[PDB]
Amino acid sequence: WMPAYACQRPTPLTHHNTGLSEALEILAEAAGFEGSEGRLLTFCRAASVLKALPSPVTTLSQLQGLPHFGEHSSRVVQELLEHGVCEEVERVRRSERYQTMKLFTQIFGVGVKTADRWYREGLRTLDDLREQPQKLTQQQKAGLQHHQDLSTPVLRSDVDALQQVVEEAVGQALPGATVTLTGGFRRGKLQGHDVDFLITHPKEGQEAGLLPRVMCRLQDQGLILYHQFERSFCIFRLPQPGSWKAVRVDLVVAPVSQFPFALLGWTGSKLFQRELRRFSRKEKGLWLNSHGLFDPEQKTFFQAASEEDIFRHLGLEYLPPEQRNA
DNA sequence: CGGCATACG
DNA sequence: CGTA
DNA sequence: GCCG
Ligand SMILES: Nc1nc2c([nH]c(=O)n2[C@@H]2O[C@H](COP(=O)(O)OP(=O)(O)OP(=O)(O)O)[C@@H](O)[C@H]2O)c(=O)[nH]1
Numbered sequence: 270w271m272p273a274y275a276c277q278r279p280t281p282l283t284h285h286n287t288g289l290s291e292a293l294e295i296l297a298e299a300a301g302f303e304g305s306e307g308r309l310l311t312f313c314r315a316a317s318v319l320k321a322l323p324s325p326v327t328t329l330s331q332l333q334g335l336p337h338f339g340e341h342s343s344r345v346v347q348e349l350l351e352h353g354v355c356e357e358v359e360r361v362r363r364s365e366r367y368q369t370m371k372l373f374t375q376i377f378g379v380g381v382k383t384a385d386r387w388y389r390e391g392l393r394t395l396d397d398l399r400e401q402p403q404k405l406t407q408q409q410k411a412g413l414q415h416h417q418d419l420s421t422p423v424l425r426s427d428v429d430a431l432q433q434v435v436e437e438a439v440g441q442a443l444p445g446a447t448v449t450l451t452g453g454f455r456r457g458k459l460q461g462h463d464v465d466f467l468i469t470h471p472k473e474g475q476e477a478g479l480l481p482r483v484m485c486r487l488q489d490q491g492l493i494l495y496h497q498f499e500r501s502f503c504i505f506r507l508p509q510p511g512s513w514k515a516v517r518v519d520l521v522v523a524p525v526s527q528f529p530f531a532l533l534g535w536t537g538s539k540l541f542q543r544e545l546r547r548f549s550r551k552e553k554g555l556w557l558n559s560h561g562l563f564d565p566e567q568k569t570f571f572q573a574a575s576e577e578d579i580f581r582h583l584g585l586e587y588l589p590p591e592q593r594n595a
Numbered sequence: 596c597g598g599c600a601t602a603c604g
Numbered sequence: 605c606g607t608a
Numbered sequence: 609g610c611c612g
């Protein structure tokens with residue numbers, strides 16, 4: 270019926286079980302806030318299964334045979350089908366622990382571990398953090414200062430103007446270098462919390478040393494509100510009607526030999542990529558990352574000229590980015 | 596039961 | 605530890 | 609939490 274790995278099935282951005290998937294993803298998120306990566310994965314995968322279905326789930330019977338639905342996830346769906354609400358999910362939603370971990374981890378520079386420590390220390394609100402700035406890293410100070418802007422979704426309409434600014438700086442840094450939009454926008458999203466760009470050059474090796482040159486030029490243009498190599502996680506100044514707003518932008522450089530692997534990895538979704546790497550390793554005996562695909566028996570790397578090549582070498586039907594919304 | 600993606604900053 |  |  271439906272295969273067990275999310276990389277084996279198309280997953281569109283919009284689907285027929287939105288409410289059920291959102292409920293499961295609350296439990297997934299809450300598991301992650303408690304450090305239970307296994308439970309987070311199962312709830313994420315069960316949610317993703319529903320996203321891949323061709324029609325709404327109406328009755329519990331329709332979960333029989335679907336992968337990743339056991340007693341717990343099935344009970345969640347059952348309660349939503351019978352009452353429109355799942356008591357467990359609602360308890361999580363209104364819990365002080367969930368709400369505060371959510372608010373803290375949403376800060377750029379704050380992960381689960383930091384948020385958990387703050388929570389145990391008694392901290393609960395953004396103003397609690399602002400009042401004791403001595404415990405904050407420079408990254409976290411920037412994420413806290415910019416938090417309101419960064420909490421607002423970026424529009425696909427904003428992205429093109431920003432891509433052109435990046436292209437101009439990239440072209441000065443290295444003529445002929447290219448900029449490719451990746452992340453959720455490449456999967457078709459009309460909004461997102463940040464913009465992702467992948468940079469390369471058609472002559473292998475010319476990209477060496479490129480990212481610092483790009484960042485220096487963007488900084489000289491006054492566009493960088495914050496930046497800390499081949500990956501840069503920045504906060505950019507983006508024009509707005511009569512003003513501007515802070516936006517998170519990630520820049521990545523890859524040599525053209527690795528570009529298909531980097532494009533695949535940075536286009537996501539996060540669950541899709543984890544499932545693809547898991548499939549590669551556990552079903553095909555091959556090790557996948559954003560740089561390449563390694564056969565550990567022959568000790569050789571697969572040359573890829575396209576994403577299509579990578580799917581073929583893993584024995585998977587090709588999925589365009591818009592069907593990778595696992 | 597073991598496993599749960601895999602890097603870089 | 606943070607980030608993707 | 610679930611799969612194999
Ligand atoms: N956020 C995130 N992305 C990750 C991780 N690991 C990983 O490979 N990625 C890759 O990085 C890509 C871009 O990260 P992102 O957070 O901007 O993802 P996105 O564009 O779908 O999210 P957004 O729509 O909220 O902007 C993901 O789609 C995914 O392929 C991870 O742990 N977290």
Ligand SMILES: [Ca+2]
Binds near residue numbers: 332333334335338339
């Ligand atoms: Ca089952």
Ligand SMILES: [Ca+2]
Binds near residue numbers: 454461462464
């Ligand atoms: Ca993004």
Ligand SMILES: [Ca+2]
Binds near residue numbers: 452464465519608
């Ligand atoms: Ca990103």
Ligand code: NA
Binds near residue numbers: 374378380
């Ligand atoms: Na964070």
